[PDB]
Amino acid sequence: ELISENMHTKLYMEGTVNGHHFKCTSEGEGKPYEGTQTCKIKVVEGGPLPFAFDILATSFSKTFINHTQGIPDFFKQSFPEGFTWERITTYEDGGVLTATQDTSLQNGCLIYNVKINGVNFPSNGPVMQKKTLGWEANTEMLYPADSGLRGHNQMALKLVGGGYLHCSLKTTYRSKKPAKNLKMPGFYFVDRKLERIKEADKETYVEQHEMAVARYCD
C-alpha cells in the first residue's frame, strides 16, 4: 500500500566512462500501476559528457511496470524495504557499461542511487563520437534466479547515417524483503519503449519517458 497511484522519484548517479568522471541527478514522477513515468535529468559534474547520453538511459525505475495477467510484482512487493539491481550492458563494438543501483522509499518518495562503470568504448565508435539516435522498443525476459530475478534484454541503438549497434543487457534484481514474505513470479516478459520529451545544452539536461508493461506470451 506504500506504492500509490502517483509516485515521485529522486535519483543520484555517479560514474566514469572511458576514464571520464561524471554525476547526474534527476527527479521524476509516474503512475506505478500504469507502467508510465518521466524523469528530468541534469548532468551536474563532468558535463558536457564526451559520450552519447543514450548509454545512461536505462540506468535512470522498476517500480513503474504495469504487471498484467496477475503476474506477481517482485518490485512493488519489496517495499517498504526496497530492492537493488545490477546490470551489464555489452555493446557489440567493445564498450561495456555496468551499473549498480539501490532503490529505497523515504517519506513517500522513491530514492535511487546509481554507480556506473563504462569501459573500453572505442574512441572512434558512435558512442564516443556522439553519433547515436536513441533506442528501439524492446522486450525483457525475467525469471527467478540467484535468489532474486534475472532479466535478459537485447537492444538496438540507432546510428547517425543508418544502421544499428546491438547490445545485450543481463540484470539481477534483488529484494531487501525476506524471501518468505515474497510471492515470486514465474517466467514473464516486459515490453518497453523509452523516449525523450526534450533535452538541451549538449545533453546536459534530458527528460525521458518510459512505458513498461509486463505480460505473458501474446
Q: Residue 60, class by beta-carbon neighbours within 10 Å (0-12 exposed, 13-18 middle, 19+ buried)?
A: buried
Give the residue before each break in the chain, using a C-to-N cut-off of over 2.5 angstroms; say none if it is continuous.
60
Residue located via cell numbers 519503449: 193
Question: Buried b vs exposed e over 80-99: b needs ≥16 C-beta within 10 Å?
Answer: eebbbbebebebeeebebbb
User: Measured in whole angstroms, how far is the alpha carbon of residue 18 from the centre of its chain?
Assistant: 20
| Domains held by the chain: number | 1
Closest CA to 60 of 192, 217, 188, 214: 192
- Kindly give the residue spans of alpha helices, DSSP state H, lying in the chain: 74-77
Its domain, for residue 65, covers: 1-218
Residue located via cell numbers 547517425: 160
- Separation CA 5–CA 63 (nearest Å): 11
Header resolution in angstroms: 1.6
Maximum pairwise Cα distance, the chain? 52
Q: Which technique?
A: X-ray
Check which CATH number belongs to the domain holding 95 and give it: 2.40.155.10
